[PDB]
Amino acid sequence: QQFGRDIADTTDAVRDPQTLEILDITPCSFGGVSVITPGTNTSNQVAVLYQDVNCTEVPVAIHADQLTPTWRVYSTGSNVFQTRAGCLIGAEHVNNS
Amino acid sequence: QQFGRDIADTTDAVRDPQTLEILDITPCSFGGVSVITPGTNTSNQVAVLYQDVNCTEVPVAIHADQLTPTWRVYSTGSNVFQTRAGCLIGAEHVNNSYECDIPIGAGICASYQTSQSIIAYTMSLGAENSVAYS
Amino acid sequence: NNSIAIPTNFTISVTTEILPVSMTKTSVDCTMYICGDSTECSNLLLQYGSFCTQLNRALTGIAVEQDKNTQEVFAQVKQIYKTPPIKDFGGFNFSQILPDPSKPSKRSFIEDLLFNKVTLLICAQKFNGLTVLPPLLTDEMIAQYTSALLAGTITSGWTFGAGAALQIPFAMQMAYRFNGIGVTQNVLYENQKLIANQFNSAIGKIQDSLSSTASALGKLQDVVNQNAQALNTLVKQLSSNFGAISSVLNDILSRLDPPEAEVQIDRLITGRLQSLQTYVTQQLIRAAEIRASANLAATKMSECVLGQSKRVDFCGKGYHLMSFPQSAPHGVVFLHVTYVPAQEKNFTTAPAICHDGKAHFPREGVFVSNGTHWFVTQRNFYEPQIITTDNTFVSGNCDVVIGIVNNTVYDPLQP
Amino acid sequence: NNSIAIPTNFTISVTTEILPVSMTKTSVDCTMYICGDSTECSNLLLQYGSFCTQLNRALTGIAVEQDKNTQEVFAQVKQIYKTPPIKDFGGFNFSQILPDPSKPSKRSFIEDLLFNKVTLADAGFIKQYGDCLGDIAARDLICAQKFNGLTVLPPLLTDEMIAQYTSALLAGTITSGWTFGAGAALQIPFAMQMAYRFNGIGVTQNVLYENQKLIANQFNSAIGKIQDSLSSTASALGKLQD
Amino acid sequence: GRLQSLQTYVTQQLIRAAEIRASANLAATKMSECVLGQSKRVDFCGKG
Numbered sequence: 001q002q003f004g005r006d007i008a009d010t011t012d013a014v015r016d017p018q019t020l021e022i023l024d025i026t027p028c029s030f031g032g033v034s035v036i037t038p039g040t041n042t043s044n045q046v047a048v049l050y051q052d053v054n055c056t057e058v059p060v061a062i063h064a065d066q067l068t069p070t071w072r073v074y075s076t077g078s079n080v081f082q083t084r085a086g087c088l089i090g091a092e093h094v095n096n097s
Numbered sequence: 098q099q100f101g102r103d104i105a106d107t108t109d110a111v112r113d114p115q116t117l118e119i120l121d122i123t124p125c126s127f128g129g130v131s132v133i134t135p136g137t138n139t140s141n142q143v144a145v146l147y148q149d150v151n152c153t154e155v156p157v158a159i160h161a162d163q164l165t166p167t168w169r170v171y172s173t174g175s176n177v178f179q180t181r182a183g184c185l186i187g188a189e190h191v192n193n194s195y196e197c198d199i200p201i202g203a204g205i206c207a208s209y210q211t212s213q214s215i216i217a218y219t220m221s222l223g224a225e226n227s228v229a230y231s
Numbered sequence: 232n233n234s235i236a237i238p239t240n241f242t243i244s245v246t247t248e249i250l251p252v253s254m255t256k257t258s259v260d261c262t263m264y265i266c267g268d269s270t271e272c273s274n275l276l277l278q279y280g281s282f283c284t285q286l287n288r289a290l291t292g293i294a295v296e297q298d299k300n301t302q303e304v305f306a307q308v309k310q311i312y313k314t315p316p317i318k319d320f321g322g323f324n325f326s327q328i329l330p331d332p333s334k335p336s337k338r339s340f341i342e343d344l345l346f347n348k349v350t351l352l353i354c355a356q357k358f359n360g361l362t363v364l365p366p367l368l369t370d371e372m373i374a375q376y377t378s379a380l381l382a383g384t385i386t387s388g389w390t391f392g393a394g395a396a397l398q399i400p401f402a403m404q405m406a407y408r409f410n411g412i413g414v415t416q417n418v419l420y421e422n423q424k425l426i427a428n429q430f431n432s433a434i435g436k437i438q439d440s441l442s443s444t445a446s447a448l449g450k451l452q453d454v455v456n457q458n459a460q461a462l463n464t465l466v467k468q469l470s471s472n473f474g475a476i477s478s479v480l481n482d483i484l485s486r487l488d489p490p491e492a493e494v495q496i497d498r499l500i501t502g503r504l505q506s507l508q509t510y511v512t513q514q515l516i517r518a519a520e521i522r523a524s525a526n527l528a529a530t531k532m533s534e535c536v537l538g539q540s541k542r543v544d545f546c547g548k549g550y551h552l553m554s555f556p557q558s559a560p561h562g563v564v565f566l567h568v569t570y571v572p573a574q575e576k577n578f579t580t581a582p583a584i585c586h587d588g589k590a591h592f593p594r595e596g597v598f599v600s601n602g603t604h605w606f607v608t609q610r611n612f613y614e615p616q617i618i619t620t621d622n623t624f625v626s627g628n629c630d631v632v633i634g635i636v637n638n639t640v641y642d643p644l645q646p
Numbered sequence: 647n648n649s650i651a652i653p654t655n656f657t658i659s660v661t662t663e664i665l666p667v668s669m670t671k672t673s674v675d676c677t678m679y680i681c682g683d684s685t686e687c688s689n690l691l692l693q694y695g696s697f698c699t700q701l702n703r704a705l706t707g708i709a710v711e712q713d714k715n716t717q718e719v720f721a722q723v724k725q726i727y728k729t730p731p732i733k734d735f736g737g738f739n740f741s742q743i744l745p746d747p748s749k750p751s752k753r754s755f756i757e758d759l760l761f762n763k764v765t766l767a768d769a770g771f772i773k774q775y776g777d778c779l780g781d782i783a784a785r786d787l788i789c790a791q792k793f794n795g796l797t798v799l800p801p802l803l804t805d806e807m808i809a810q811y812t813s814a815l816l817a818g819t820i821t822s823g824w825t826f827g828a829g830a831a832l833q834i835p836f837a838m839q840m841a842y843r844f845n846g847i848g849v850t851q852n853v854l855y856e857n858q859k860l861i862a863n864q865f866n867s868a869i870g871k872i873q874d875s876l877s878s879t880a881s882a883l884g885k886l887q888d
Numbered sequence: 889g890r891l892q893s894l895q896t897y898v899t900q901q902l903i904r905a906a907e908i909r910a911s912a913n914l915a916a917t918k919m920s921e922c923v924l925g926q927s928k929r930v931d932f933c934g935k936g
């Protein structure tokens with residue numbers, strides 16, 4: 001073997017030509033984001049939701065080394081909550097229904 | 098700045114290079130044309146509708162001056178009536194109201210009746226009724 | 232297993248239902264859109280086949296459909312009825328929904344709230360190959376249809392929808408409409424003033440609900456917004472070069488001769504044609520959405536307005552009595568009048584009654600007891616009535632039914 | 647012209663009708679799908695105008711539509727009725743459709759059969775999509791990005807939430823019949839409720855009470871027949887699997 | 889090619905959405921009539 005391909009005929013596995021080992025490919029783009037906000041006339045506060053994204057993996061996915069501080073505050077803090085729909089940041093979870 | 102554009106990146110304003118005066122550009126008058134035909138079985142008289150077009154620039158649409166004499170009817174004649182749908186030619190407005198035969202738009206309808214000509218009229222909603230409620 | 236709740240009261244709820252009927256009629260020309268006043272482009276467009284005829288034919292099919300959609304929804308009666316000048320409907324207050332001649336427009340008050348609550352460079356787009364054909368029926372005429380429908384409904388009820396209109400007092404029209412819910416006429420007449428006050432107040436709350444900032448006309452406003460963005464996007468695509476050197480045909484024809492401008496001009500046509508093809512295809516799907524709504528609107532008026540419909544939660548929430556149609560921009564608004572049961576009370580019930588070793592069942596109602604004495608009462612209202620042989624029908628004996636209870640049935644002719 | 651036939655008997659028949667309500671909510675990142683991680687391609691995409699802005703807008707419109715579809719069919723009552731602890735409905739047997747508190751979820755016994763009749767095994771994209779959330783060994787496994795921007799949004803109403811609506815609807819229908827859908831729920835014995843329902847068919851009430859026990863057995867057995875149809879190899883969920 | 893493929897899928901989704909939505913409206917109608925009440929519409933809420 002020299003390389004592996006997925007269903008879409010795109011590279012997904014390959015072997016190091018030197019040591020002849022086994023390794024995979026991990027794409028990293030992170031375009032799947034949503035913005036939650038009330039009417040701008042009401043308030044400027046915003047909560048961001050990341051679909052099907054682990055809360056712990058947000059700092060690695062965002063590539064914080066090349067981000068403005070305005071986005072860094074959305075990668076950590078106290079108002080971080082995990083949901084089955086993804087990771088929600090900027091909203092305070094409440095028990096009441 | 099010398100050129101002003103609209104949402105479609107089409108110049109809607111300009112400045113004359115010779116004199117620094119702001120000059121406006123608006124697209125020339127245009128629109129679709131429709132023909133009201135009672136039916137070849139019935140007759141051949143036809144009324145042409147210029148949709149959403151002023152009647153003042155109808156004849157300039159074509160070079161009827163140097164065309165066949167049959168095309169001169171659009172520069173004269175009393176069969177030139179303005180409607181909300183547009184400029185209607187070949188039919189005469191009538192005060193009476195009848196059931197709609199050939200819908201036109203904006204509540205007016207055209208029909209052919211009897212010397213013989215096509216009439217443009219406001220469609221009648223139906224027989225006027227007044228329930229004898231008590 | 233032996234407890235029932237029979238309402239001792241009622242509440243006339245006038246809920247509103249909003250339904251789109253027709254959308255803006257639009258027509259597009261290939262030459263104006265794709266090859267604007269260009270001979271070279273137009274001559275190069277005709278060799279792409281009869282796409283453009285399909286575009287025009289499809290849109291015209293939509294445009295005529297929109298005019299048709301309004302016909303079934305509104306043009307249900309060919310007779311234009313007029314409400315009598317005297318507003319004597321047993322205390323019912325109709326002046327705020329019937330047309331008011333004290334305004335230049337012959338619409339009604341609730342109808343005018345609706346027109347002001349829908350917000351329609353809009354004219355600039357109309358000069359770029361896009362035309363908006365006016366509706367066949369204008370707003371004033373559509374308002375006359377609704378006035379005719381109302382005049383028939385108040386004056387004649389459901390008869391005018393099933394043939395010749397038959398004038399009947401509105402007090403009796405409502406009285407039978409209760410009878411269709413299973414509610415005896417005596418309920419209405421004994422408290423006719425109460426019902427009228429509830430109906431009058433119910434209509435008033437509709438005015439306040441619409442008059443405030445609570446914009447409940449999301450559906451109709453969505454239709455305008457959906458069409459507006461589609462047209463706005465369509466014209467905006469003319470600014471995209473689709474890989475060409477420029478997004479304007481006139482410049483290309485000026486800076487390039489035909490032999491090598493054919494490559495560039497062809498690129499724009501494919502992109503512009505595809506964008507126009509996307510618009511019509513999206514419009515055709517939307518027309519189906521409106522057509523389904525238009526059929527639903529026509530169905531509701533045929534059943535809810537022209538008659539009393541037994542279909543639950545189809546002509547308003549609760550036991551539907553009758554509806555009022557109201558014209559709205561690009562749609563119709565129904566004012567469903569429903570009979571909502573009100574305050575209840577505990578009651579002990581038995582399926583049957585055993586007096587002479589024979590089970591007695593209620594002809595129409597249920598057997599209830601408020602603690603000491605058994606009574607047969609209406610299902611949807613509480614008027615206790617003595618158990619009598621004329622109010623019950625006997626069937627079988629008492630050893631078969633489960634839950635039967637001893638009680639004496641008064642004989643109406645024994646004394 | 648002088649002969650009529652009149653039934654001397656009846657059979658209570660229960661039949662199952664299956665109707666699709668919502669479809670999978672999918673969203674596509676056009677820039678990724680067409681120009682995945684390619685800056686050069688992204689610039690060329692802008693030259694094509696705001697095509698995929700419509701596509702995201704169109705798909706988003708569909709996505710919100712599915713939630714509206716589910717809400718308008720299930721969320722018809724704003725009161726979450728609960729069945730009474732005592733199941734005394736004149737001999738009728740509703741255990742096979744009412745929720746089972748013993749199970750961790752509130753799905754009733756029949757609803758369990760329905761969920762087992764629809765499978766994702768015959769699917770490559772979807773089946774491998776779910777396994778990502780269960781993968782911890784892989785490093786930086788962001789599967790919202792591995793599928794060329796193709797993602798499936800979760801339904802707004804989860805299965806447990808929907809099951810509560812059906813349980814509420816069943817509880818209202820069982821204990822109140824039709825009133826709860828036309829105002830405040832009105833308690834009434836189930837024997838009386840069916841007697842009225844018979845009265846709506848044109849058969850007097852005494853028919854039901856005189857043989858109420860017989861009717862209850864017919865209904866319970868009728869419910870049992872659905873079990874064999876659904877619990878066996880017979881796959882009647884063709885309108886949802888498609 | 890990819891855009892047309894994506895556009896074709898979106899168009900097909902819209903058609904399928906209408907069919908599902910039409911089914912959803914029917915389901916709500918059946919729930920409104922068959923479940924919340926008794927319907928006299930023959931063959932609308934079962935067989936019989």
Ligand SMILES: *[C@@H]1O[C@H](CO)[C@@H](O)[C@H](O)[C@H]1NC(C)=O
Nearest residue numbers: 038039040041042043044444
């Ligand atoms: C909404 O915006 C308007 C500006 O048009 C402002 O007057 C109003 O106070 C705002 N209301 C809220 C609740 O944000």
Ligand SMILES: *[C@@H]1O[C@H](CO)[C@@H](O)[C@H](O)[C@H]1NC(C)=O
Nearest residue numbers: 232233633634635732734736
């Ligand atoms: C109804 O249920 C109660 C509860 O124990 C019971 O005592 C009574 O006998 C039952 N009656 C009927 C008719 O089922």
